[PDB]
């Protein structure tokens, strides 16, 4: 018994896994990796994310919706001067 509560430890941010991280680094061209990188990366990626996400959400309400659109986030990207092609 007492197994209904045995796995409550998700805490999303590790969901970006070390194998992927190195897989990411391997595509980038890094040959060998410190172990503290993985965690430090988690910080860099997240802090990146909301700033757009904030801006990305920042649009949504102004047009009085409740469902985030790619075009919305498309504009979100442009404002910081990193433009993307391919989602209209």
């Amino acid at each position: 018994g007492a197994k209904r509560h045995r796995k409550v430890l998700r805490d999303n941010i590790q969901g970006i896994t070390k194998p992927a991280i190195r897989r990411l680094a391997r595509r980038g061209g890094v040959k060998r990796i410190s172990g503290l990188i993985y965690e430090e990366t988690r910080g860099v990626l997240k802090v990146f994310l909301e700033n757009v996400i904030r801006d990305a959400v920042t649009y949504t309400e102004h047009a009085k919706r409740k469902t985030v659109t790619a075009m919305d986030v498309v504009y979100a990207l442009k404002r910081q001067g990193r433009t993307l092609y391919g989602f209209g």
Binding site: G1, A2, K3, R4, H5, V8
Partner: protein
């Protein structure tokens, strides 16, 4: 093909002139060429190659089945569940094996929980047929492919819902005799991927089988029906507006007779109540219990959005889980040691009545089955089963293949002390027999009443030697009340026609 197509109409056109009407209602290939020329111009002894006795309706179904074969027309063995319809099929496969002497390639499909039973019953009754449980891994399925399946060293093959989709390509190259489809409920959706994998195989006959008939709609009815004889209908909305949904506008309820008259000589229903074979009905009680006062805090916290700062993207399920069990909301159990005691049954609305009924049924010797929707909730029941120290076996969605068999065997073992039996709803009760059990209880209600009917009759089949005492759990003053009423709504829109078919901040700068 066309000779059979002419020969199919030899039996199709012998019915009412409605088939000519449907052929002439197409808005047309050369089916008219063979229609115009026609327009202007056994084994009732329970054959003993089986090892046992066939029931009288069983023979009739088989004789009805052999007629469809001799007619070269298709159909659906729609006999009510637990009427030994597996024996009817096993006898029918013997009918082809011995009378016509064509032991050939056969394909049968069963839910994951049920592949054991069909192999078990085929061995018990007609041991002369080569069948496999096509289970195992990607490599473990391969040596079945090249060695025996590619070697044509078999008669029937027993696979699951997904395996055939996993094995579509190695199965196309083998032409079949029937595609035997048990519990044909995934086919209700045309876009259900299993439908597009089955319209691609080439078998001379296509024997669809079910435990319950159509669930909700006429659209669904010809969804089963369109794959039966596809070259004949080849139409989707043509069939629908032809019958116009039980006269949804005029409510004549007399054009339904035309629906019944085509399907009565095209399809077969038998019910348990008519030919008992068990001579004992089942009881039903709906244990309306009040929703627990302790969780009333969180239930209000869900209604008023008071615990906080989470999703409510499906308020349906959120209230459903609170209607089901409070500790499911990730914090209703505050204990860092996660105490396991009477507080669980205390804080829960249902388990108090469950604890009472478990104590009663323990003394009465009632061998109970429990069905539920949430596998996570079953963990708590598994924990609470540990609290009461009952023997049992937990089958859940994707536990194992051999574990399903062994847990079933231990529960159905003679004089099995496994007093309770944890089981899911959509993974557990789709064809297995549990005659060792008598009483079956639902923890929660499902938005599919025929599935509710499908699940309940697990213990109430041929071989049930006690009175089936159903105790459905419905929460008082809850949203579960509306689901059951809606469950009744979908029930009565369907039962009414089926019964006719059989009969006929500011200034705070950080700086």
């Amino acid at each position: 093909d066309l000779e059979g197509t002419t020969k199919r109409f030899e039996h199709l056109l012998s019915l009412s002139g409605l088939f000519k009407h449907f052929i002439e209602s197409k808005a047309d290939p050369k089916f008219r060429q063979v229609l115009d020329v026609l327009e202007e111009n056994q084994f009732r002894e329970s054959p003993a190659y089986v090892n046992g006795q066939l029931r009288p309706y069983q023979i009739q179904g088989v004789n009805w089945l052999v007629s469809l074969h001799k007619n070269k027309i298709a159909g659906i063995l729609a006999d009510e569940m637990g009427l030994g319809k597996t024996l009817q099929t096993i006898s029918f496969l013997g009918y082809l094996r011995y009378i016509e002497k064509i032991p050939g390639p056969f394909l049968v499909i069963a839910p994951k929980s049920t592949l054991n039973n069909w192999l078990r019953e085929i061995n018990r009754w007609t041991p002369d047929v080569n069948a496999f449980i096509l289970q195992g891994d990607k490599e473990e399925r391969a040596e079945l492919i090249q060695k025996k399946l590619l070697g044509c060293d078999f008669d029937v093959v027993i696979a699951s819902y997904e395996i055939i989709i996993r094995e579509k390509s190695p199965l196309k190259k083998i032409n079949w005799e029937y595609i035997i489809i048990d519990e044909a409920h995934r086919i209700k959706n045309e876009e259900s991927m299993l439908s597009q994998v089955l319209r691609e195989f080439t078998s001379r006959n296509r024997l669809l089988i079910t435990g319950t008939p159509l669930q909700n709609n006429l659209h669904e009815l010809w969804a089963l029906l369109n794959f039966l004889l596809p070259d004949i209908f080849s139409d989707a909305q043509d069939f629908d507006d032809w019958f116009s949904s039980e006269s949804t506008e005029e409510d004549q309820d007399k054009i339904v007779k035309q629906l019944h008259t085509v399907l009565q000589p095209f399809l077969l229903r038998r019910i348990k109540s008519d030919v008992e074979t068990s001579l004992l009905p089942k009881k039903e009680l709906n244990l309306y219990v009040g929703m627990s006062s302790m969780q009333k805090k969180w239930y209000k916290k869900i209604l008023e959005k008071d615990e906080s700062k989470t999703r409510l993207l499906n308020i349906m399920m959120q209230l459903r889980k609170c209607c089901n069990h409070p500790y499911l909301f990730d914090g209703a159990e505050p204990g860092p040691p996660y105490t396991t005691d009477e507080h669980l049954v205390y804080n829960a609305a249902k388990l108090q009545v469950l604890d009472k009924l478990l104590k009663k049924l323990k003394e009465e010797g009632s061998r109970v089955l429990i069905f539920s929707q949430m596998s996570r909730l079953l963990d708590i029941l598994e924990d609470y089963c540990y609290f009461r120290n009952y023997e049992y076996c937990r089958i859940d969605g994707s536990t194992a293949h051999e574990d399903r068999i062994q847990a079933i065997d231990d529960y159905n073992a003679p004089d099995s002390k496994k007093f309770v039996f944890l089981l899911t709803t959509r993974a557990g009760g789709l064809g297995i027999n549990l005659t060792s059990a008598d009483v079956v209880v639902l923890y929660d209600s499902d938005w599919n009443p025929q599935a509710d009917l499908q699940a309940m009759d697990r213990a109430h089949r041929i071989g049930q030697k006690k009175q089936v005492k159903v105790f459905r759990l419905v929460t008082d003053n809850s949203v579960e009340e509306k689901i059951l009423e809606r469950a009744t709504q979908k029930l009565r829109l369907d039962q009414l026609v089926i019964q006719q078919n059989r009969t006929s901040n500011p200034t705070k700068r950080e700086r």
